[PDB]
Amino acid sequence: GTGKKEKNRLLREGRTPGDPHVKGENFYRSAKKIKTLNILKEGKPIRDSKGKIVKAASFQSKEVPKAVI
Amino acid sequence: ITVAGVRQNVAELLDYSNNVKKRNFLETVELQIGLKNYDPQRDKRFSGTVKLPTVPRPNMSICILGDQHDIDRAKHGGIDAMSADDLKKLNKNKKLIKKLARKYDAFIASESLIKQIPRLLGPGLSKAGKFPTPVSHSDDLSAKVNEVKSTVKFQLKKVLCMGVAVGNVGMTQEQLVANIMLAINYLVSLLKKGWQNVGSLTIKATMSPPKRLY
Amino acid sequence: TTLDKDLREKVVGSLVLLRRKDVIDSVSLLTTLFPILISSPSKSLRTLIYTKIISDLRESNAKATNHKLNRTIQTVLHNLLTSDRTSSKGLWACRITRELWRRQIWTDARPCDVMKEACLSDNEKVVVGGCRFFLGGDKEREELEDEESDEDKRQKAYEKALEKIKKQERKKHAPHPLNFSALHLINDPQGFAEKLFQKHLQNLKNKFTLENRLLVLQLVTRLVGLHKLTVLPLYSWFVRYLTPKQLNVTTFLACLAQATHNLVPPDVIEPLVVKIANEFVSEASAAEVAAAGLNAIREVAMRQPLCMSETLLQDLVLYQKSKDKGVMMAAKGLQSLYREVYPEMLQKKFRGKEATMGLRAGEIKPLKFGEEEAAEDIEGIELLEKYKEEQKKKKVEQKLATTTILTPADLAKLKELRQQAKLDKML
Amino acid sequence: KEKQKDFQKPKLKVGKPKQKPSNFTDTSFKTKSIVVNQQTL
RNA sequence: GUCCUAAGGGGGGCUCAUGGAGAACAGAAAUCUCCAGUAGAACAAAAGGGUAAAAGUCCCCUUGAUUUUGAUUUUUGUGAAUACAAACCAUGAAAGUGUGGCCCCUUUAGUCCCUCGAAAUUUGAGGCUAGAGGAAGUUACCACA
RNA sequence: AGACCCUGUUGAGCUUGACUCUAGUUUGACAUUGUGAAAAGACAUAGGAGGUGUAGAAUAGGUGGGAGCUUCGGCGCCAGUG
RNA sequence: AUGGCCAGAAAGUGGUGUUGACGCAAUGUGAUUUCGCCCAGUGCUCUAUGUCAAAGUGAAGAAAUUCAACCAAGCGCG
């Protein structure tokens, strides 16, 4: 099934290699659909082996911004 | 194409035009050119001019559209001329301007009147491809007429065939060869691919069988 | 009209199917479909019949160009345009010609003549369709040109000069702007431009909208610039429109720039440039207005440089000291343009290096109206003869145009020598 | 071009009508009539 | 797709922005005259540093915006800059000043470049040198450390 | 030493236009593969004939020469129309 | 029935089949009573240009080789 490969699908669609390709994009999923459906998958931080957070979750920044006007 | 071949081709051309069958007028030697591997509209139409060392055309009539001083120089040199008053008398009539363009093969204007030519004769000379050549009050009118007579035009248009006069029967063989080779070399220089675009070359008189270089 | 929509679509599809089965003729199917396309009130039926007609033309000319069928259909479209100028049914002829031209099924000059009659029409939509045919095909022409092109410290300064020489060589051999096949294939371009200008642009009775008048103006100006025509009243017609208060004045200035060319007199362009300078580039004018005016002046000066006076050009070049970036870059563009073209008007501070060296040595000559090249010898022929003499001297140690045959290798060597001489002159 | 100022200065465009001021209040509105497509019982 | 990413060197002359007072039209604003004017002008950093017989502006000649070799700084090779060394120059009466701008794959070429290992030639290939360009989820069925 | 959370060069089950494959299937060519007739298509050549948008005496692919050709009747240039 | 759906490494192999559409096979829904439109997208299915493998053909070369047409099914179109 060479015609069902993602490269051949993109060539028959018209997209040129070098365009941004979000991980998980296939025939059933566009970049908009992947970004929409990954919102339900958000909410997990990145931890080390000991359990302390090395990179926080979405909107859990821990960093205090500089608030001036 | 070999120069000895050029020499022998123009040799039987002169032989036929002078000995075998001589017409009542003076025939004009001309070169016909075919093109290949080229698009007339997608690619640029090249335009160029080259001065032949000898006058190919003794019978050209050249009109002079200039001031009173240039008219005096023209009548001193025995060349017919026309004034801006006469151009105003024409009153921008397309038929009359077309008749003038048909009657005179070339036009020569001064700087002071060459900017007034398109507002007096309208688009007639540009339509006929006979826009005047500038001449100064310091340049020699007879000399200017000489290179205007000796100069041919190499302009491309909608088709892939061209024809340029390169000489006549009465003027002789060696400078015939010089004019023909100069025209061919200038053509090759103007071509973007040189000899890769030369479809066919052919010299003939006004009323004569063709002689193919290529 | 009376039948159900699905049933009439199935009838048209069945007729096309019978044509594919070769039961009926293409001419018979087209003559039984086209009047219904013209007079049908149903938009879906009109679109479907138009699509079936386009598919029929594509299938008929897939094997070979069916000249009889193409000529008959072009005759029908021309008669439809000629029958009623005020009728709006000529838009179908315009749309069919656009689709077949972009599919490259029709390439002959008869669709060009049909759209010429479409431009010379009373109906605004038909005029818009014909003008769009001649104008908006430039995008497809650029796409085709792109396809054809796809088919085809001191050392750094020398490399930059070589790149500049390569850009100059590309300008010397790179296709002319505003170039389009139908614009070339139409006959009597001067008469067509004059007819359009008198019919639509000169007439105040024409109630065309401003965008449509701009489309007609774009067509006229591209014709004038491309075929080097002389339409004198057009330059007097731009006079009332060259104002910053005028809407789409950028489009008007672009049209004037495209209208200008080499054989236009400096006497008729100079009042336009003076008016642009006064209205657009002034002390009370805004920075954007000044930048737009200077950009338009630079475009007109590229097309015809003799329009300027020397004092006006020096005044406009002095606007490069402005604190606005747009005005600065526009003035520097005008100065650079006159640096290559006519450096004598520029001030000695503003000429630059190569201009002053050329004017001192005497190679740079004044540009004049109507002056054409009159080279008795080929360019680089002296360098080629010098190279041949050097080769002969080397062989001995171990005029060319008149007698010697121009070899293609010799022509390539002469071109390389000319490029080397240009690089040496730049250095 | 990624800078986000608190206030964005409007840009004057030649050949186009001037934009209305930032403090301008537009009172024009369009209304659509709701209709219930149900016959008398 | 068009446009801008900046003219340097030498010598000479003169001061700029602005303010006050004056001259038919002429006034807030056109040109001319005097006085005051430490830079409040200009120099391609919009409120950094530096420049007044100049580093600004104008005029006259010019392309040191040129080849070659090392050293130093930013720090293997770069690149930029700094004093030079040699040649060729420019300018000025001369001292001097000027070596810029105030601070990993693809592909091309090689006559006298080398190999294809039994010998030679012609195509081709390899090498060296010098260039140009640029691989998705789920587990509330679960399991392991 | 359960369950829960977290970590992994994690293991395994399952899904899908994720990547690389594959059984099967389908299509074309060659062989198996013998005895006979008829047709077309494509090139190669040997040629031959044609051009109405309107206007114009004609039904103008176009180009460049050209005022003279002439078979001695005329055709031309000129004019007209483009 | 020179068939559909399946098994088998293959087979002069096998199941349905000691069968023949009131049958076999694959599905969904799930007694009885009661209960439109759209082929937009994705599937499935029926019918000369484009895309177009191998073999075969033609040209160039001293050959390797290079370039050309032709080009089934599928995809695309309908």
From Swiss-Prot, chain C:
GO cellular component: nucleolus
Domain of life the protein comes from: Eukaryota
Keywords: Coiled coil, Nucleus, Protein transport, Ribosome biogenesis, Transport
Compartments in which it is found: Nucleus, Nucleolus
Any one GO BP annotation for this protein: ribosomal large subunit biogenesis
Quaternary structure and interacting proteins, as annotated: Associated with the 60S pre-ribosomal particles.
Family: Belongs to the SDA1 family.
Its job: Required for 60S pre-ribosomal subunits export to the cytoplasm. May also be required for 60S ribosomal subunit maturation and accumulation.
Name assigned to this protein: Protein SDA1
Taxonomic source organism: Chaetomium thermophilum (strain DSM 1495 / CBS 144.50 / IMI 039719)
Gene label: SDA1
Residue range from the parent sequence: 97 to 646 of 767
Swiss-Prot record, chain D:
Subcellular location as annotated: Nucleus
Biased composition (Basic residues): 10-19
Disordered: annotated span: 1-26
Family from the record: Belongs to the IPI1/TEX10 family.
Subunit relationships: Component of the RIX1 complex, composed of IPI1, RIX1/IPI2 and IPI3 in a 1:2:2 stoichiometry. The complex interacts (via RIX1) with MDN1 (via its hexameric AAA ATPase ring) and the pre-60S ribosome particles.
Task of the protein: Component of the RIX1 complex required for processing of ITS2 sequences from 35S pre-rRNA.
Protein name: Pre-rRNA-processing protein IPI1
Record organism: Chaetomium thermophilum (strain DSM 1495 / CBS 144.50 / IMI 039719) (Thermochaetoides thermophila)
Full-protein interval shown: 9 to 49 of 338
